[PDB]
Design a binder for these strands. Structure first.
Lengths: 135, 189, 197, 171
RNA sequence: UUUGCUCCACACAAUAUAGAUGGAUACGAAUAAGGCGUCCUUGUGGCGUCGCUGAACCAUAGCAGGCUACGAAUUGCAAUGUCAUUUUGCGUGGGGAUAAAUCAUUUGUAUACGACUUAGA
RNA sequence: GCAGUCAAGCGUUCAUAGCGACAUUGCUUUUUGAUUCUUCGAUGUCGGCUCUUCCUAUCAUACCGAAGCAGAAUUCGGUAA
RNA sequence: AGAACUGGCGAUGCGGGAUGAACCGAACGUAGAGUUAAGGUGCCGGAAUACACGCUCAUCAGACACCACAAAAGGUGUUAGUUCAUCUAGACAGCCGGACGGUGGCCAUGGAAGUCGGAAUCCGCUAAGGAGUGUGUAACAACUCACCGGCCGAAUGAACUA
RNA sequence: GGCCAGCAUCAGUUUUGGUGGCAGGAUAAAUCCAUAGGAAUGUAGCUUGCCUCGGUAAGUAUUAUAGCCUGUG
């Protein structure tokens, strides 16, 4: 008969191979990848390319990321760094709006006052054309 | 403990299409259709085929999984009630006083009253649910036959009947009078 | 950092609202709470009802007009919960609680002004998914609020009067974004993007 | 505490009748080299006619983990004194470190049985070499091929106290 | 005997602050779910896309902000370095409006006295 | 004073429908005690009459459950003051 | 009520214990700065709606020892756990089928093939079926299971601790 | 000329931070490298009903068209 409309969610789910991003830690902000699972609350990870050591960490301190790649259960630092370069994970990550807005915030914070004045100047020119055009 | 993934699987025959969103279910079929609300339970759904849904609950902890199979048997019975339907065959019991049962249209919709319950003069009536049909037998005329699609409505109506005509201040071990159910079945099987 | 803060109160917890409000209003911030009839509260319905039927029991014995004034409406239940957290027996609490104007539903003046939300009192984030909660409208009406089904006739008219404005503004801003994005490829934007705009 | 694992070798004082008194080794889980000695002289004094004064601590060392970056299924045999009676248990734990197993043991005991550190004696802690000698299901369910589960109900910690939009729990 | 009342219009003066010197910047609803854009056999729809904090968005130069289509120093190294907005008084000119209560007398549908209830050009 | 657990047995056969010793864990301050902390430069001290309120460990009244309840009449219990 | 060692109140303020002569901390000239004790950090209330591992949802929940109270016996409510075994030589559960012949094996005989009752108890057939687990006709019969087979393809029991 | 403020320079007490060097432990363990064996929550490959290029079925198979563990250095 007619198709059955159904949808609950498509979560980003912890698994052997998922990328994560740390929000609170000694190396927060830097990417990482999951190796395997300990229990419901904590896992072990290693981001070798970003300089993350091989840790065991809970899941409150991290944020699961949509992008994912493949690796076997119980992997090691070298294998992880290998597949990390294989899957173009860093470039898949820098291409999304999340990393764009992170770098946006971090460049807005790094503005000298001359640049904060430049932006006040520049925004007056674009909105002038936009008000000339929406009229 | 807390589990990980406890999932049941609901089959679906042909002629049934289940529109499910925000746990507000709609289930159609030849007999008719039936809605349902499950906002008060935390459970997922995945339409892996047009022939079965996979219902699942995560960790939960022995009080969510207890409701998982409950949900599954609600949906299974609703699909059953829109594919085939339900009937309840009730009977009467007495020795001396009959139980004159009738359907009367009062100021609103149908009511189903009984007279002469142990010689009472309270002409007691009952409201009929909106999704229910009703009839009598012909092999014998000391019965009644409820029918419909929602079992929780039909059986609740039958229970409403047999709860109001209960004997009181008398030994029920002796005065085995009233009405009762005798068969739950379908109107296509 | 605003002069007045209009706190919507849907899906919020009572005693966890009142502990941020009781501090932010003692620190000077005018806080007007609104849609207090849709508040939420922990525990079950019968439980949070008996915790009030064991409060209607506590009246003065010799003249019950001197005693605890059992207010039945949500805007006064919440005000009682805040008055407990505030030292209202001084000219500091007396001056704080005039910085607080509470209503049921949204009136016209706060219809057009932007509402906010307090995340450290939301049922959504605080209460475990699966527990039982109680709706303060249901409670107040079970203990004798006469003015619920009127608020339902006012609030839906508020909602239809606001949603059409939202659609009107949608169909004004969708093309503002076009006028910007269709003109944001000059140096004026290629230079702002290098600064983070 | 922030537990560490020690290695304590003790020795009854040299008496001239026997100036080579056979040594005794204990592998202890504790916070530091002050209470390691105390737990040694506690667990020994109930096994040998020797006190703190009638003996000397030959060696104290710290055992670090051989492969702390490797998940293990530990099995812990233990005894614990209730309010009314003493019992023995066997609890299985999944963690990377011999000492983090003890960390999550004392809490899992102080919660489920309300036994404090003074009413607990760690008897045996052992790795499991192969994944069929396990017996507990809360451990076994994490041994499935291609394990995957979500975190359905996310909550974001608010830095500021007010917000201007409903938050959403989707991850 | 518009001495007096009442407003709006500005000319000051006086008194007061439970405390502003960029903007209280508007859908609703659910959270084991939603928004936004498009298409449409307009459906509890297909596709894409977003959060992961408002750390945003809007305005933002100009004698504490000007002459015109230049001047801004010497408060001599800091001293709120004055602007908010109610309440009230005064004179001027451009207006509009012309009454009720109480005491006393009296009634008794009422009453300890007050009070209440009525009547009186 | 009030209540509960065992159940040795009574209960036409039928431990517990009701009852229930041998023992035992409790509750109360409406009994009688015990003690002497307050008051000896005085708290006016028995009962009755009048009057208001509250408590439940409910005699009656309401809906009920349970029996060695056929009906009637009764006993036990519960929500309940 | 009455004694022993020590400490304290009396003679003693201060911070804490909501308030308390005795408890915890600590003993005092008037002031300033710093750090702390005992106790606490949602608000009153000055201070983390801090972090991590778990438990509990209670129609009188529970929350600063002294201190302002609470038991015996119980609960498949839930958690974690000890002991014992069943078992892919198909248990545990459910549905389907068989449960028959020697023989009414004997006495109570007003009538019991098993059965209102009582002394008594073995074979054939077998996958397997009792001289019988109940319902019942004055009797017989007809029903059910202990006993085994078919779908079943996993584990299920029993007792106990806190 | 005296009083009240600001700044610098120093003194006493104290607080909060950034950073460098050195020593130790199993002269950290670990990661990484070399190397000998072992196993599966069985990777390829090969058997296997069909087919999404062996995708399912479940045998085989110890690194191979992924990897892991254990030990030693």
């Amino acid at each position: 008969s007619t198709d059955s409309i159904v949808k609950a969610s498509n979560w980003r789910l912890v698994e052997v191979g998922r990328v994560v991003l740390i929000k609170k830690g000694q190396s927060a902000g830097k990417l990482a990848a999951i190796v395997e699972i300990i229990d419901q609350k904590k896992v072990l990870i290693d981001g070798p390319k970003a300089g993350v050591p091989r840790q065991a960490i809970n899941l409150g301190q991290v944020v699961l990321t949509p992008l994912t790649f493949a690796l076997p259960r119980g992997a090691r630092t070298a294998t992880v760094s290998k597949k990390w370069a294989a899957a173009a994970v860093c470039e898949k990550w820098a291409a999304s709006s999340w990393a764009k807005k992170i770098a946006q915030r971090e460049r807005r914070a790094a503005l000298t006052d001359f640049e904060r004045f430049q932006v006040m100047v520049l925004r007056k020119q674009k909105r002038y054309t936009v008000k000339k055009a929406l009229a | 403990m807390k589990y990980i993934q406890t999932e049941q699987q609901i089959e679906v025959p042909e002629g049934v299409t289940v529109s499910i969103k925000s746990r507000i279910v709609k289930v159609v079929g030849p007999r008719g259709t039936l809605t349902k609300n499950l906002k008060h339970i935390d459970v997922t759904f995945t339409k892996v085929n047009n022939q079965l849904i996979k219902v699942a609950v995560h960790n939960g902890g022995r009080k969510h999984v207890a409701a998982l199979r409950t949900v599954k048997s609600l949906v299974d019975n609703m699909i059953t009630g829109v594919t085939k339907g339900y009937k309840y065959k009730m009977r009467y019991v007495y020795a001396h006083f009959p139980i004159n049962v009738n359907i009367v249209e009062k100021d609103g919709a149908k009511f189903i009253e009984v007279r002469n319950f142990l010689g009472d003069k309270k002409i007691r009536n009952v409201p009929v649910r909106d999704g229910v049909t009703i009839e009598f037998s012909t092999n014998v005329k000391d019965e009644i036959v409820l029918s419909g699609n929602s079992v929780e409505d039909v059986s609740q109506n039958a229970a409403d009947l047999q709860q109001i005509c209960r004997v009181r201040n008398k030994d029920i071990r002796k005065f085995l009078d009233g009405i009762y159910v005798s068969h739950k079945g379908f109107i296509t099987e | 950092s605003q002069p007045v803060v209009v706190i919507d109160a849907k899906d919020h917890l009572l005693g966890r609202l009142a502990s941020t409000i009781a501090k932010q209003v003692l620190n000077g911030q005018k806080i007007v709470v609104v849609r207090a009839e849709a508040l939420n509260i922990s525990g079950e319905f019968f439980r949070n009802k008996l915790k009030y039927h064991d409060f209607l029991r506590k009246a003065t014995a010799f003249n019950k007009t001197r005693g605890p004034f059992h207010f039945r409406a949500p805007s006064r239940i919440l005000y009682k919960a805040i008055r407990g957290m505030v030292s209202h027996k001084t000219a500091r609490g007396k001056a704080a609680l005039e910085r607080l104007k509470i209503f049921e539903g949204i009136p016209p003046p706060y219809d057009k002004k932007k509402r906010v939300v307090v995340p450290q009192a939301l049922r959504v984030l605080r209460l475990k998914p699966g527990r039982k909660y109680t709706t303060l409208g249901k409670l107040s009406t079970s203990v004798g609020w006469k003015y619920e089904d009127v608020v339902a006739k006012l609030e839906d008219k508020r909602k239809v009067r606001s949603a059409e404005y939202y659609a009107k503004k949608r169909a004004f801003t969708k093309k503002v974004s076009s006028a910007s994005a269709a003109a944001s490829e000059s140096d004026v934007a290629k230079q702002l993007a290098s600064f983070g705009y | 505490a922030h537990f560490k694992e020690y290695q304590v070798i003790g020795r009854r004082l040299p008496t001239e009748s026997v100036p080579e008194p056979k040594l005794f080794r204990m592998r202890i889980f504790a916070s530091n080299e002050v209470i390691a000695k105390s737990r040694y002289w506690y667990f020994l004094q109930k096994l040998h006619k020797v006190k703190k004064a009638s003996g000397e601590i030959v060696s104290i060392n710290q055992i670090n983990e051989a492969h702390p970056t490797k998940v293990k299924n530990f099995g812990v045999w233990v005894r614990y004194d209730s309010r009314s009676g003493t019992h023995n248990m066997y609890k299985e734990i999944r963690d990377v470190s011999r000492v983090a197993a003890v960390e999550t043991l004392y809490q899992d005991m102080a919660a489920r049985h309300r036994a404090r550190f003074r009413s607990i004696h760690i008897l045996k802690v052992a790795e499991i070499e192969k994944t069929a000698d396990v017996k507990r299901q809360y451990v076994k369910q994490f041994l499935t091929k291609d394990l995957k589960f979500p975190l359905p109900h996310r909550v974001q910690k608010s830095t500021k106290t007010f917000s201007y939009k409903r938050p959403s729990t989707f991850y």
